[PDB]
C-alpha cells in the first residue's frame, strides 16, 4: 500500500488543497447545474470524492487503478467542456500539479 498511501496522503491531499479543486470535489450535480447530457457523454464519470472514498475503503487492487481514475477525471473534463471555459483552465492547472506529484512518487 506504499504507492496507494502516497496517492492518499500526498497526491489527493495536495490536489484537494489547490484553490481550483472545488469543481472536482463531488460528482457533477446534473440536476442543480442543469447538465442533462453530462452523464450521456461521460459514461465513466469520476471525481476526487469518489477517489477519496475508494482509498479510504481500500477499493483499489493496485496504485495504477487509482492513477487511471485521476486520469479519467481530467480526460472527462476536457471531453465535456470547451477550450476557453474556466473549468478547463482549472483542470489544466490541477493536472500540471498532479503530474508533478506522480514524478515525485517513490517506487512500489
Ligand atoms: C468536473 C465538472 C464540474 C463542473 C461544475 N461543478 C460545479 C459546482 N458548482 C458550481 C457553482 C454552482 C453555483 O454556486 C457556485 C458554484 C459550478 C460547477 N461546475 C461548472 C458549471 C463550473 C465550474 C467552474 C467554474 C464555472 C463553472 N461542471 N462540469 C461541466 C464539469 O465537467
UniProtKB/Swiss-Prot annotation:
Gene (UniProt): BRDT
Marked site: Histone H4K5ac binding: 81, 86
Compartment(s) of residence: Nucleus
Function of the protein: Testis-specific chromatin protein that specifically binds histone H4 acetylated at 'Lys-5' and 'Lys-8' (H4K5ac and H4K8ac, respectively) and plays a key role in spermatogenesis. Required in late pachytene spermatocytes: plays a role in meiotic and post-meiotic cells by binding to acetylated histones at the promoter of specific meiotic and post-meiotic genes, facilitating their activation at the appropriate time. In the post-meiotic phase of spermatogenesis, binds to hyperacetylated histones and participates in their general removal from DNA.
PTM statement from Swiss-Prot or TrEMBL: Ubiquitinated in a SPOP-dependent manner, leading to proteasomal degradation.
Other noteworthy facts: BRDT is a promising target for male contraception. Inhibition by thienodiazepine inhibitor (+)-JQ1 that binds Asn-81, prevents recognition of acetylated histone H4, causing a complete and reversible contraceptive effect in male mice.
Assembly and interaction partners: Interacts with mRNA splicing machinery proteins SRSF2, DDX5, HNRNPK and TARDBP. Interacts with the acetylated N-terminus of histone H1, H2, H3 and H4. Interacts with P-TEFb components CDK9 and CCNT1/cyclin-T1. Interacts with SMARCE1. Interacts with the acetylated N-terminus of histone H1.4, H2A, H2B, H3 and H4.
Domain comment quoted from the record: Bromo domains mediate interaction with histones that have acetylated lysine residues at specific positions. Bromo domain 1 mediates binding with histone H4 acetylated at 'Lys-5' and 'Lys-8' (H4K5ac and H4K8ac, respectively). The bromo domains also recognize and bind a subset of butyrylated histones: able to bind histone H4 butyrylated at 'Lys-8' (H4K8ac), while it is not able to bind H4 butyrylated at 'Lys-5' (H4K5ac).
Protein name: Bromodomain testis-specific protein
Residue ranges of domain Bromo in the record: 1-105
Disease: Spermatogenic failure 21: An infertility disorder caused by spermatogenesis defects and characterized by acephalic spermatozoa in the semen of affected individuals. SPGF21 inheritance is autosomal recessive.
Binding site for JQ1: 81
